[PDB]
Design an enzyme around this catalytic site. Structure first.
Site, PDB file in Angstrom:
ATOM      1  N   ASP A  35      -8.288  -1.949 -14.458  1.00 46.63           N
ATOM      2  CA  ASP A  35      -7.928  -0.945 -13.467  1.00 46.63           C
ATOM      3  C   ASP A  35      -9.120  -0.609 -12.576  1.00 46.63           C
ATOM      4  O   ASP A  35      -9.990   0.158 -12.974  1.00 46.63           O
ATOM      5  CB  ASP A  35      -7.415   0.312 -14.188  1.00 46.63           C
ATOM      6  CG  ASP A  35      -7.014   1.419 -13.238  1.00 46.63           C
ATOM      7  OD1 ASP A  35      -6.843   1.136 -12.055  1.00 46.63           O
ATOM      8  OD2 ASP A  35      -6.856   2.572 -13.688  1.00 46.63           O
ATOM      9  N   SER A 199      -8.966  -0.590   6.195  1.00 51.29           N
ATOM     10  CA  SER A 199      -8.177  -1.667   6.775  1.00 51.29           C
ATOM     11  C   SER A 199      -8.133  -1.460   8.282  1.00 51.29           C
ATOM     12  O   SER A 199      -8.155  -0.323   8.770  1.00 51.29           O
ATOM     13  CB  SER A 199      -6.758  -1.702   6.193  1.00 51.29           C
ATOM     14  OG  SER A 199      -5.943  -2.621   6.899  1.00 51.29           O
TER      15      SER A 199
END
Length: 330
Positions: A35, A199
């Site tokens: 994770d 992004s």
């Protein structure tokens, strides 16, 4: 040094991936959920409330010659899905795909919430976010990657998640055969403890790419792709019959629909998520309504590039002094 381990989906939907981890001496192999959105390595154990153990493989520290109890230490964690666990703390020898860390903090669960109990396939978590998020008290402990870093040939690990298939976690090297074209690297902020990046935009299907900054985290421990409501609405508007259902808790669509791809930007480069990756199957057994793999982050407080996004890419987690993230198509 390096390590290489295969990671395998827990079910037919890629709800999560498990990776075998050797703990203790002799080794006890547990299947852990790697994770990159948390920083605790915790396991089902001989100490876990028996009524909260249901099919998982447990770590028994008393059977390990190398287990050491961290005196007085405790841990307690809550996850974004509302799950939780807590317990005490050992150090022990931990190996992943041939890479060994001695004195790794192995957090032994005394208590786990029902969602963990009910998932027989996951024996615990192995956190790969920054150690600033580690929950051990009174003194925070280091992640497996942090402990291994200085020994690694290169201070990196890579995630190559499979679509309805196994994939790979590599430590210490970049497998140049595992991706197409080039890797584009992008800056990381560690201020919140995550692999946080920006992004450069998105496209829906064959639409023109929209240039726009989207801050988010690369999180292998989250199933879906969670993005701002504007972006997500734009996507589902291109799917016939799709709607947001408060009852179901997100966007649903007719299972017979053709889903468009979804593109996200990494610098001037682009990762394309095929439409098929965005289908998470019937909302309940036998339903002709399907649950979407792109959902709104509104209410989470952060955008999350989870498995739906990451499995479309070869992803480099560069843990150098100034960390970066790299993305390549594959």
């Amino acid at each position: 040094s390096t390590g290489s381990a295969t990671t395998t989906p827990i079910d037919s939907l890629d709800d999560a991936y498990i990776t075998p981890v050797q703990i203790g001496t002799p080794a006890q192999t547990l299947n852990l959920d790697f994770d990159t959105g948390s920083s605790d390595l915790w396991v089902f154990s001989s100490e876990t409330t028996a009524s909260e153990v249901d099919g998982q493989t447990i770590y028994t520290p008393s059977k390990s010659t190398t287990a050491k109890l961290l005196s007085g230490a405790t841990w307690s964690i809550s996850y974004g899905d509302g799950s939780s666990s807590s317990g005490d703390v050992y150090t022990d020898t931990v190996s992943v795909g041939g890479l060994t860390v001695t004195g790794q903090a192995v957090e032994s669960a005394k208590k786990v919430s029902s969602s963990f109990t009910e998932d027989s396939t996951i024996d615990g978590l192995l956190g790969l976010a920054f150690s600033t998020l580690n929950t051990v008290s009174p003194t925070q402990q280091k992640t497996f990657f942090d402990n291994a870093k200085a020994s690694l040939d290169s201070p990196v690990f890579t995630a190559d998640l499979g679509y309805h298939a196994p994939g790979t976690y590599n430590f210490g090297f970049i497998d140049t055969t595992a991706y197409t074209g080039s890797i584009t690297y992008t800056a990381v902020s560690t201020k919140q403890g995550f692999w946080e990046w920006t992004s450069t935009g998105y496209a829906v299907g064959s639409g023109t790419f929209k240039s726009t900054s989207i801050d988010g985290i690369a999180d292998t421990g989250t199933t879906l792709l969670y993005l701002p409501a504007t972006v997500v609405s734009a996507y589902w508007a291109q799917v016939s019959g799709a709607k947001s259902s408060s009852s179901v808790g997100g966007y649903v669509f007719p299972c017979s629909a053709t889903l468009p791809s979804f593109t996200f930007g990494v610098g001037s480069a682009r990762i394309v998520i095929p439409g098929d990756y965005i289908d998470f199957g019937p909302i309940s057994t036998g339903s002709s309504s399907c649950f979407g793999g792109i959902q709104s982050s509104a209410g989470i407080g952060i955008n999350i590039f989870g498995d739906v996004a990451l499995k479309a890419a070869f992803v480099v987690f560069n843990g150098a002094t100034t960390p970066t993230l790299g993305f390549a198509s594959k």
